[PDB]
Design a protein around this ligand. Structure first.
Ligand SMILES: CC(=O)c1ccc(C[C@H](N)C(=O)O)cc1
Length: 307
């Protein structure tokens, strides 16, 4: 529960833990995350929002960048409409219990000086490298657009927004974060969150891939996605259900299951759950039932708030 450790819990990485220590010591600390507005808000978003809440709980002021022109540059549609999706995403984040100030990229990302710095960065950023930073983010396009390489350098110019101490993102953001680390004068702590695996286990969870559990999915919908979900006995790596168990559920967890095979089993950490599953001592069916029911309970307040 040590702040540093609660912040670190379930992150992939923190560049750098030292700097982070330096930031925790300050009275005023602030942290930033940015999202291309998404028509559906899913566990991937929630993982990251959860982490912002940890930070908020550690006395950080939180900023949410509703990245409308990033979405525009990444071919998500017309600004006007991207904005209204963004405003919907705000509601959801508020429903998740975030206490944040919300900003649309467009509010400041088209300022003369902002673009002038974007063009300054474009001089120091190679095409090869900008392309490389967008592999995990760029909307698939057989004929890649100039917009693709503008996107990252605009992102980089926004990382220092309101002199934030810390920036948060999924691991797919890290090549762009690295560009920023290098190019920008003052360093901010990157905190990176892991990318959840799709329910079919085939890629990583995304809105455009339809392999996700949305935070306002119906319970019937949650049970069915999870029933359908890839979850091979003994395999944890690439198992989205394990992932959910690791990242969302409270412990101790009380996996109810028929006496016929074991009866109710009580586990005290995700690590205990891991070996039980590795052994093939907990069956995917039983795992799924416990996960689905706990998720439904977890997600219920948020679902509820959204009406
Ligand atoms: C700092 C900044 O401008 C920023 C903009 C957009 C994003 C969104 C992120 N690139 C995504 O894939 O959702 C993150 C940070």
């Amino acid at each position: 529960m040590d702040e540093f450790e609660m912040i670190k819990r379930n992150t992939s990485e923190i560049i750098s833990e030292e700097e982070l220590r330096e930031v925790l010591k300050k009275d005023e600390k602030s942290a930033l995350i940015g999202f291309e507005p998404s028509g559906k808000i899913h566990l991937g978003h929630y993982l990251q929002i959860k982490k912002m809440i940890d930070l908020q709980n550690a006395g950080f002021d939180i900023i949410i960048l509703l990245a409308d022109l990033h979405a525009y540059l990444n071919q998500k549609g017309e600004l006007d409409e991207i904005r209204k999706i963004g405003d919907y995403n705000k509601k959801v984040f508020e429903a998740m219990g975030l206490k944040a100030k919300y900003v649309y990229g467009s509010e400041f990302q088209l300022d003369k000086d902002y673009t002038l710095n974007v063009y300054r960065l474009a001089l120091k950023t190679t095409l090869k490298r900008a392309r490389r930073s967008m592999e995990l983010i760029a909307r698939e396009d057989e004929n890649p657009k100039v917009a693709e390489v503008i996107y990252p350098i605009m992102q980089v110019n926004g990382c220092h927004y309101r002199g934030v101490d810390v920036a948060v993102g999924g691991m797919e953001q890290r090549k762009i974060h690295m560009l920023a680390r290098e190019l920008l004068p003052k360093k901010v702590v990157c905190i990176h969150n892991p990318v959840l695996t799709g329910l079919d286990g085939e890629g990583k969870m995304s809105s455009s891939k339809g392999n996700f559990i949305a935070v306002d999915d119906s319970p019937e919908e949650i049970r069915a996605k999870i029933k359908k979900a890839y979850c091979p006995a003994g395999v944890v790596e690439g198992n989205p259900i394990m992932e959910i168990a690791k990242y969302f559920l409270e412990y101790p967890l009380t996996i109810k299951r028929p006496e016929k095979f074991g009866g109710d089993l009580t586990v005290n950490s995700y690590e205990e759950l891991e070996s039980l599953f590795k052994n093939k001592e907990l069956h995917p069916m039983d795992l799924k039932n416990a996960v689905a029911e706990e998720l439904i309970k977890i997600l219920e307040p948020i679902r509820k708030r959204l009406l």
